[PDB]
Amino acid sequence: SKGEELFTGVVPILVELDGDVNGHKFSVRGEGEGDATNGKLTLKFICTTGKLPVPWPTLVTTLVQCFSRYPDHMKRHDFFKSAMPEGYVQERTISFKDDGTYKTRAEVKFEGDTLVNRIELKGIDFKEDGNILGHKLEYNFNSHNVYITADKQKNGIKANFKIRHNVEDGSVQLADHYQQNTPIGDGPVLLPDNHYLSTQSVLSKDPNEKRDHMVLLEFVTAAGITHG
């Protein structure tokens, strides 16, 4: 499919995020690599401003869907790779149930041979002693499905999904995601039909890392359209 050739083999990844949650400014830098053919991602993130003011799990979805493994019969529906190398703008509003909201804007594109994700995140209205600012979320991540649909007006796509964050007391903190992606340059000839991405993530720690950080392993595939 369009842009798929740019993802053959292993591609280096760079992620940079600047954020402000309820007035707490922070920055995160991540590096790793992606194997789109296998829908596999490996990255290590570090908070470059000291202690992260929010739980690491709340930033997972913000911190490169172009690395998804699309089945042979669904290749053309891969908007993410179709927008490369120029890239795409990815915007989201993440609403944490009974808590605050994250507004994010990112640009995902190639800078040389490296796929880079540069993001700006503003978090507002988080409550004191809540699951987020109170750091009550467990250091793990569930598997989810990202529902994608075409957005004719913006010549791109929209996505909706609900992240389930395990809370230390056994409860679940929901985070509703509203997403919009627009091509920076040329996009696909045809916008995708409705489909979804199946995601699985594994969070871990680097025993030799003293800084606040997150080691992440991710597996993503696309489905929802049957093979002819």
Side-chain angles (χ1 to χ4, degrees), residues 1-50 52-151 155-209 211-228:
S1 59
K2 184 181 182 68
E4 180 170 36
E5 280 70 9
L6 297 172
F7 291 86
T8 58
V10 177
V11 175
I13 302 172
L14 171 62
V15 182
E16 292 201 1
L17 174 162
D18 283 337
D20 178 321
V21 176
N22 279 51
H24 306 69
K25 291 183 180 181
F26 66 91
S27 291
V28 171
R29 177 192 177 71
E31 301 181 6
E33 52 182 48
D35 178 354
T37 302
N38 286 308
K40 176 186 180 178
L41 294 171
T42 55
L43 293 162
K44 177 180 174 183
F45 300 97
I46 58 172
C47 178
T48 61
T49 49
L52 196 66
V54 297
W56 277 107
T58 69
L59 301 181
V60 170
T61 57
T62 296
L63 288 171
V64 283
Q65 298 177 310
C66 47
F67 284 102
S68 302
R69 177 186 181 191
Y70 273 70
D72 56 8
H73 65 88
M74 284 180 66
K75 297 294 186 178
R76 85 164 185 71
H77 297 88
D78 186 350
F79 166 85
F80 310 105
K81 294 185 188 60
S82 294
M84 297 297 159
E86 291 172 295
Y88 54 79
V89 176
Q90 175 161 300
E91 297 169 291
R92 291 210 185 96
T93 287
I94 300 174
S95 304
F96 293 84
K97 189 180 181 180
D98 199 36
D99 211 321
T101 301
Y102 283 171
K103 178 180 179 60
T104 69
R105 182 183 187 284
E107 281 182 27
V108 184
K109 70 188 72 172
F110 274 94
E111 296 198 320
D113 301 306
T114 300
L115 187 288
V116 183
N117 179 23
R118 301 202 182 277
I119 320 133
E120 287 102 55
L121 175 158
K122 186 174 182 181
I124 58 178
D125 306 321
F126 283 90
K127 64 190 182 185
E128 186 192 305
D129 188 50
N131 292 152
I132 292 72
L133 291 181
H135 289 72
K136 307 183 181 185
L137 301 183
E138 306 192 313
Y139 190 68
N140 48 41
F141 217 77
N142 290 304
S143 301
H144 306 87
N145 296 115
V146 173
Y147 298 96
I148 298 175
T149 187
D151 189 357
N155 184 49
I157 59 171
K158 285 189 176 184
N160 297 81
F161 55 101
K162 295 187 178 181
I163 293 297
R164 286 166 286 101
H165 290 118
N166 284 14
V167 187
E168 45 178 39
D169 66 357
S171 63
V172 175
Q173 169 65 249
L174 299 172
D176 293 312
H177 284 59
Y178 171 57
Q179 180 182 327
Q180 294 172 296
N181 295 64
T182 305
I184 288 175
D186 299 0
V189 173
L190 294 57
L191 290 177
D193 286 329
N194 286 17
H195 68 282
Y196 65 88
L197 304 182
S198 177
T199 61
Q200 301 119 75
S201 312
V202 175
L203 312 187
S204 62
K205 297 289 184 183
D206 182 322
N208 304 305
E209 184 54 85
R211 294 169 296 183
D212 206 343
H213 69 294
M214 170 173 72
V215 174
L216 174 60
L217 167 61
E218 188 158 296
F219 277 124
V220 187
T221 61
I225 297 180
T226 58
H227 185 302

PDB file of all heavy atoms in Angstrom, residues 70 74 76-78 148-150 157 190-196 223-225:
ATOM      1  N   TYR A  70      -1.299  -4.146   9.264  1.00  0.00           N
ATOM      2  CA  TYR A  70      -2.558  -4.289   8.541  1.00  0.00           C
ATOM      3  C   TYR A  70      -2.517  -5.586   7.743  1.00  0.00           C
ATOM      4  O   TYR A  70      -1.504  -5.905   7.128  1.00  0.00           O
ATOM      5  CB  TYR A  70      -2.774  -3.124   7.566  1.00  0.00           C
ATOM      6  CG  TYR A  70      -3.449  -1.911   8.168  1.00  0.00           C
ATOM      7  CD1 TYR A  70      -2.788  -1.104   9.093  1.00  0.00           C
ATOM      8  CD2 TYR A  70      -4.762  -1.587   7.828  1.00  0.00           C
ATOM      9  CE1 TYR A  70      -3.422  -0.009   9.670  1.00  0.00           C
ATOM     10  CE2 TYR A  70      -5.407  -0.496   8.392  1.00  0.00           C
ATOM     11  CZ  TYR A  70      -4.733   0.290   9.314  1.00  0.00           C
ATOM     12  OH  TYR A  70      -5.360   1.367   9.885  1.00  0.00           O
ATOM     13  N   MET A  74      -6.349  -5.554   3.780  1.00  0.00           N
ATOM     14  CA  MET A  74      -6.762  -4.269   4.345  1.00  0.00           C
ATOM     15  C   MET A  74      -5.721  -3.173   4.162  1.00  0.00           C
ATOM     16  O   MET A  74      -5.910  -2.058   4.635  1.00  0.00           O
ATOM     17  CB  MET A  74      -7.020  -4.408   5.847  1.00  0.00           C
ATOM     18  CG  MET A  74      -8.313  -5.081   6.233  1.00  0.00           C
ATOM     19  SD  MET A  74      -8.451  -5.157   8.023  1.00  0.00           S
ATOM     20  CE  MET A  74      -8.598  -3.410   8.430  1.00  0.00           C
ATOM     21  N   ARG A  76      -4.787  -0.994   1.863  1.00  0.00           N
ATOM     22  CA  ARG A  76      -5.157   0.338   1.393  1.00  0.00           C
ATOM     23  C   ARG A  76      -5.895   1.177   2.431  1.00  0.00           C
ATOM     24  O   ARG A  76      -6.001   2.395   2.285  1.00  0.00           O
ATOM     25  CB  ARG A  76      -6.013   0.250   0.123  1.00  0.00           C
ATOM     26  CG  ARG A  76      -7.497   0.055   0.386  1.00  0.00           C
ATOM     27  CD  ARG A  76      -8.312   0.371  -0.854  1.00  0.00           C
ATOM     28  NE  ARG A  76      -9.752   0.310  -0.613  1.00  0.00           N
ATOM     29  CZ  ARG A  76     -10.442   1.189   0.108  1.00  0.00           C
ATOM     30  NH1 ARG A  76      -9.839   2.219   0.684  1.00  0.00           N
ATOM     31  NH2 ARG A  76     -11.753   1.040   0.243  1.00  0.00           N
ATOM     32  N   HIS A  77      -6.409   0.532   3.474  1.00  0.00           N
ATOM     33  CA  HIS A  77      -7.139   1.246   4.518  1.00  0.00           C
ATOM     34  C   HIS A  77      -6.219   1.820   5.586  1.00  0.00           C
ATOM     35  O   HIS A  77      -6.682   2.391   6.574  1.00  0.00           O
ATOM     36  CB  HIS A  77      -8.169   0.324   5.173  1.00  0.00           C
ATOM     37  CG  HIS A  77      -9.233  -0.149   4.234  1.00  0.00           C
ATOM     38  ND1 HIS A  77      -9.102  -1.284   3.465  1.00  0.00           N
ATOM     39  CD2 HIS A  77     -10.434   0.389   3.911  1.00  0.00           C
ATOM     40  CE1 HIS A  77     -10.178  -1.428   2.710  1.00  0.00           C
ATOM     41  NE2 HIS A  77     -11.000  -0.425   2.960  1.00  0.00           N
ATOM     42  N   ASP A  78      -4.917   1.670   5.374  1.00  0.00           N
ATOM     43  CA  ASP A  78      -3.911   2.160   6.304  1.00  0.00           C
ATOM     44  C   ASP A  78      -3.607   3.629   6.006  1.00  0.00           C
ATOM     45  O   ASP A  78      -2.693   3.948   5.248  1.00  0.00           O
ATOM     46  CB  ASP A  78      -2.646   1.312   6.161  1.00  0.00           C
ATOM     47  CG  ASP A  78      -1.576   1.656   7.183  1.00  0.00           C
ATOM     48  OD1 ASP A  78      -1.700   2.678   7.898  1.00  0.00           O
ATOM     49  OD2 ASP A  78      -0.600   0.887   7.257  1.00  0.00           O
ATOM     50  N   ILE A 148     -11.792   3.211  13.993  1.00  0.00           N
ATOM     51  CA  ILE A 148     -11.485   4.204  12.970  1.00  0.00           C
ATOM     52  C   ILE A 148     -12.576   4.375  11.914  1.00  0.00           C
ATOM     53  O   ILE A 148     -13.187   3.403  11.464  1.00  0.00           O
ATOM     54  CB  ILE A 148     -10.160   3.830  12.254  1.00  0.00           C
ATOM     55  CG1 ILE A 148      -9.014   3.836  13.270  1.00  0.00           C
ATOM     56  CG2 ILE A 148      -9.883   4.789  11.102  1.00  0.00           C
ATOM     57  CD1 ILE A 148      -7.694   3.371  12.714  1.00  0.00           C
ATOM     58  N   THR A 149     -12.805   5.623  11.520  1.00  0.00           N
ATOM     59  CA  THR A 149     -13.786   5.937  10.491  1.00  0.00           C
ATOM     60  C   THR A 149     -13.240   7.100   9.664  1.00  0.00           C
ATOM     61  O   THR A 149     -12.422   7.883  10.146  1.00  0.00           O
ATOM     62  CB  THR A 149     -15.150   6.324  11.106  1.00  0.00           C
ATOM     63  OG1 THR A 149     -16.124   6.466  10.062  1.00  0.00           O
ATOM     64  CG2 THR A 149     -15.036   7.624  11.888  1.00  0.00           C
ATOM     65  N   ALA A 150     -13.680   7.202   8.416  1.00  0.00           N
ATOM     66  CA  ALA A 150     -13.220   8.273   7.540  1.00  0.00           C
ATOM     67  C   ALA A 150     -13.796   9.631   7.922  1.00  0.00           C
ATOM     68  O   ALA A 150     -14.897   9.724   8.467  1.00  0.00           O
ATOM     69  CB  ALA A 150     -13.580   7.952   6.088  1.00  0.00           C
ATOM     70  N   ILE A 157      -9.084  10.906   8.984  1.00  0.00           N
ATOM     71  CA  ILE A 157      -9.845   9.934   9.750  1.00  0.00           C
ATOM     72  C   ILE A 157     -10.113  10.425  11.161  1.00  0.00           C
ATOM     73  O   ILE A 157      -9.514  11.396  11.629  1.00  0.00           O
ATOM     74  CB  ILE A 157      -9.093   8.583   9.867  1.00  0.00           C
ATOM     75  CG1 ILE A 157      -7.738   8.800  10.550  1.00  0.00           C
ATOM     76  CG2 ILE A 157      -8.915   7.958   8.489  1.00  0.00           C
ATOM     77  CD1 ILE A 157      -7.014   7.522  10.917  1.00  0.00           C
ATOM     78  N   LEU A 190      -7.993   6.884  -1.538  1.00  0.00           N
ATOM     79  CA  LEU A 190      -9.314   6.662  -0.957  1.00  0.00           C
ATOM     80  C   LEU A 190      -9.182   6.639   0.556  1.00  0.00           C
ATOM     81  O   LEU A 190      -8.208   6.109   1.084  1.00  0.00           O
ATOM     82  CB  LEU A 190      -9.894   5.314  -1.397  1.00  0.00           C
ATOM     83  CG  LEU A 190     -10.262   5.044  -2.857  1.00  0.00           C
ATOM     84  CD1 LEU A 190      -9.070   5.254  -3.757  1.00  0.00           C
ATOM     85  CD2 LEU A 190     -10.758   3.612  -2.983  1.00  0.00           C
ATOM     86  N   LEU A 191     -10.153   7.218   1.250  1.00  0.00           N
ATOM     87  CA  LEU A 191     -10.128   7.197   2.703  1.00  0.00           C
ATOM     88  C   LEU A 191     -10.557   5.794   3.106  1.00  0.00           C
ATOM     89  O   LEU A 191     -11.292   5.122   2.379  1.00  0.00           O
ATOM     90  CB  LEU A 191     -11.075   8.247   3.277  1.00  0.00           C
ATOM     91  CG  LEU A 191     -10.603   9.692   3.071  1.00  0.00           C
ATOM     92  CD1 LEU A 191     -11.652  10.651   3.609  1.00  0.00           C
ATOM     93  CD2 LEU A 191      -9.263   9.909   3.777  1.00  0.00           C
ATOM     94  N   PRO A 192     -10.107   5.328   4.272  1.00  0.00           N
ATOM     95  CA  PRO A 192     -10.466   3.981   4.720  1.00  0.00           C
ATOM     96  C   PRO A 192     -11.926   3.719   5.051  1.00  0.00           C
ATOM     97  O   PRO A 192     -12.686   4.635   5.367  1.00  0.00           O
ATOM     98  CB  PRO A 192      -9.568   3.778   5.939  1.00  0.00           C
ATOM     99  CG  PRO A 192      -9.460   5.153   6.500  1.00  0.00           C
ATOM    100  CD  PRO A 192      -9.258   6.009   5.265  1.00  0.00           C
ATOM    101  N   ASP A 193     -12.313   2.452   4.944  1.00  0.00           N
ATOM    102  CA  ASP A 193     -13.658   2.050   5.317  1.00  0.00           C
ATOM    103  C   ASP A 193     -13.533   1.843   6.820  1.00  0.00           C
ATOM    104  O   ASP A 193     -12.424   1.804   7.357  1.00  0.00           O
ATOM    105  CB  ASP A 193     -14.064   0.732   4.648  1.00  0.00           C
ATOM    106  CG  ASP A 193     -14.366   0.894   3.170  1.00  0.00           C
ATOM    107  OD1 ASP A 193     -14.829   1.983   2.774  1.00  0.00           O
ATOM    108  OD2 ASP A 193     -14.159  -0.077   2.410  1.00  0.00           O
ATOM    109  N   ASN A 194     -14.657   1.714   7.505  1.00  0.00           N
ATOM    110  CA  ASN A 194     -14.617   1.513   8.943  1.00  0.00           C
ATOM    111  C   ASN A 194     -13.838   0.256   9.319  1.00  0.00           C
ATOM    112  O   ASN A 194     -14.009  -0.805   8.711  1.00  0.00           O
ATOM    113  CB  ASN A 194     -16.039   1.418   9.496  1.00  0.00           C
ATOM    114  CG  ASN A 194     -16.738   2.758   9.535  1.00  0.00           C
ATOM    115  OD1 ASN A 194     -16.322   3.713   8.876  1.00  0.00           O
ATOM    116  ND2 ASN A 194     -17.817   2.836  10.306  1.00  0.00           N
ATOM    117  N   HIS A 195     -12.963   0.389  10.308  1.00  0.00           N
ATOM    118  CA  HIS A 195     -12.182  -0.735  10.801  1.00  0.00           C
ATOM    119  C   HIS A 195     -11.620  -0.352  12.161  1.00  0.00           C
ATOM    120  O   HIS A 195     -11.899   0.733  12.668  1.00  0.00           O
ATOM    121  CB  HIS A 195     -11.051  -1.111   9.827  1.00  0.00           C
ATOM    122  CG  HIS A 195      -9.964  -0.086   9.715  1.00  0.00           C
ATOM    123  ND1 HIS A 195     -10.098   1.067   8.970  1.00  0.00           N
ATOM    124  CD2 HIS A 195      -8.713  -0.056  10.233  1.00  0.00           C
ATOM    125  CE1 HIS A 195      -8.975   1.762   9.034  1.00  0.00           C
ATOM    126  NE2 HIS A 195      -8.119   1.102   9.793  1.00  0.00           N
ATOM    127  N   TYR A 196     -10.839  -1.239  12.761  1.00  0.00           N
ATOM    128  CA  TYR A 196     -10.275  -0.940  14.066  1.00  0.00           C
ATOM    129  C   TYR A 196      -8.861  -1.465  14.228  1.00  0.00           C
ATOM    130  O   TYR A 196      -8.390  -2.277  13.430  1.00  0.00           O
ATOM    131  CB  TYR A 196     -11.176  -1.518  15.167  1.00  0.00           C
ATOM    132  CG  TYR A 196     -11.284  -3.030  15.187  1.00  0.00           C
ATOM    133  CD1 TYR A 196     -10.368  -3.809  15.897  1.00  0.00           C
ATOM    134  CD2 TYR A 196     -12.316  -3.681  14.510  1.00  0.00           C
ATOM    135  CE1 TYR A 196     -10.481  -5.202  15.936  1.00  0.00           C
ATOM    136  CE2 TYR A 196     -12.437  -5.069  14.542  1.00  0.00           C
ATOM    137  CZ  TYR A 196     -11.520  -5.822  15.256  1.00  0.00           C
ATOM    138  OH  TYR A 196     -11.646  -7.195  15.296  1.00  0.00           O
ATOM    139  N   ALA A 223      -7.962  -4.781  11.988  1.00  0.00           N
ATOM    140  CA  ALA A 223      -8.958  -5.787  11.639  1.00  0.00           C
ATOM    141  C   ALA A 223     -10.295  -5.089  11.426  1.00  0.00           C
ATOM    142  O   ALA A 223     -10.368  -3.863  11.471  1.00  0.00           O
ATOM    143  CB  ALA A 223      -9.076  -6.810  12.754  1.00  0.00           C
ATOM    144  N   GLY A 224     -11.350  -5.863  11.185  1.00  0.00           N
ATOM    145  CA  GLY A 224     -12.662  -5.263  10.997  1.00  0.00           C
ATOM    146  C   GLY A 224     -13.216  -5.351   9.588  1.00  0.00           C
ATOM    147  O   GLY A 224     -14.391  -5.074   9.353  1.00  0.00           O
ATOM    148  N   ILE A 225     -12.362  -5.719   8.643  1.00  0.00           N
ATOM    149  CA  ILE A 225     -12.771  -5.861   7.254  1.00  0.00           C
ATOM    150  C   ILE A 225     -12.415  -7.293   6.882  1.00  0.00           C
ATOM    151  O   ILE A 225     -11.288  -7.723   7.095  1.00  0.00           O
ATOM    152  CB  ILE A 225     -12.022  -4.858   6.354  1.00  0.00           C
ATOM    153  CG1 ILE A 225     -12.394  -3.433   6.774  1.00  0.00           C
ATOM    154  CG2 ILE A 225     -12.372  -5.091   4.887  1.00  0.00           C
ATOM    155  CD1 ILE A 225     -11.719  -2.347   5.969  1.00  0.00           C
TER     156      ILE A 225
END
